[PDB]
Nucleic acid binder design. Structure first.
Length: 214
DNA sequence: CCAGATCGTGCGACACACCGGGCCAATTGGCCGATGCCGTCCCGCGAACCCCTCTACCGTGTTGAGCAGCAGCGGCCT
């Protein structure tokens, strides 16, 4: 359902440096976290996609200059979902401070880094791409996909809504059962958004499926 | 041995899923229209600001070294 979509997004080549930085920051913020162990900060990011973890590791090594481990052992323990976990221990504090998770010698930033916000539209769509790669789903249970992506806390969700607005694409933040996400319902916005992210074959398949079924 | 955990199954509740209705709260944000103080400018005079002019006892002076060209001189040549 979404495996092909995320594969296509991961396989998309990227050139501009700022967009790569924004994508890395988004994925780290959404599907990543920090742990203060043995007196040092270690960054752990959990992905459930084959190529996405490699892409994130390569981006870190290239732009931020750091090394990762890329372990395949499942934190869930099932070992069937291939819950990849990429780790950064050497220079973890520097990576955290220079990627936007923590700034001002203070608490972790709830929303997306200020650098990602108030940037070019390319960086906004790159941040949305990273958010979709990290977490999200494409359900199509009934009449609409419900292209929902969950976020930690209202701040990240509303920041994603704001970023989507800059693309002239409708979006809506929602909260249920204490967990909040951003969703877009109408088919036209879904198609335009998926086209902008870079996926092509999945966009077509969805287009014909919707037109034939509806 | 055999009894609760796990799960099957069942009944109900039920938190909303819908996608569609029918009105509303908050909250407007424009400048509408009316009233009022400040920027610009046009003198008005006056302080200063710069230039020009004139004063008639009279009075009359400021190292060493290397290389090259020119002036004076001894001495033929006519």
């Amino acid at each position: 359902m979404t495996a092909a979509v995320k594969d296509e997004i991961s396989r998309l080549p990227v050139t501009r440096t700022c967009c790569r930085k924004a994508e890395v920051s988004s994925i780290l913020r959404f599907a990543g976290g920090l742990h203060l162990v043995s007196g040092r900060i270690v960054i752990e990011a959990e992905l459930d996609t084959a190529m996405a973890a490699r892409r994130l590791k390569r981006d870190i090594l290239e732009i931020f200059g750091h090394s990762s481990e890329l372990i395949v052992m499942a934190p869930g323990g099932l070992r069937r979902g291939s819950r990849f976990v990429v780790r950064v221990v050497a220079g973890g504090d520097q990576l955290a401070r220079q990627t936007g998770l923590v700034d001002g010698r203070g608490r972790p930033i709830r929303g997306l880094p200020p650098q990602v916000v108030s940037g070019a539209t390319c960086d906004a769509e790159a941040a949305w791409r990273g958010a979709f790669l990290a977490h999200g789903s494409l359900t199509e249970p009934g009449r609409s996909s419900s292209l929902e992506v969950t976020c930690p806390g209202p701040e990240a969700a509303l920041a994603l809504v704001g970023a989507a607005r800059r693309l002239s694409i409708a979006a809506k933040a929602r909260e249920v059962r204490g967990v909040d996400r951003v969703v877009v319902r109408d088919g036209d916005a879904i198609g335009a958004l998926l086209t902008r992210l870079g996926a092509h074959e999945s966009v077509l398949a969805w287009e014909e499926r919707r037109m034939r079924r509806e």
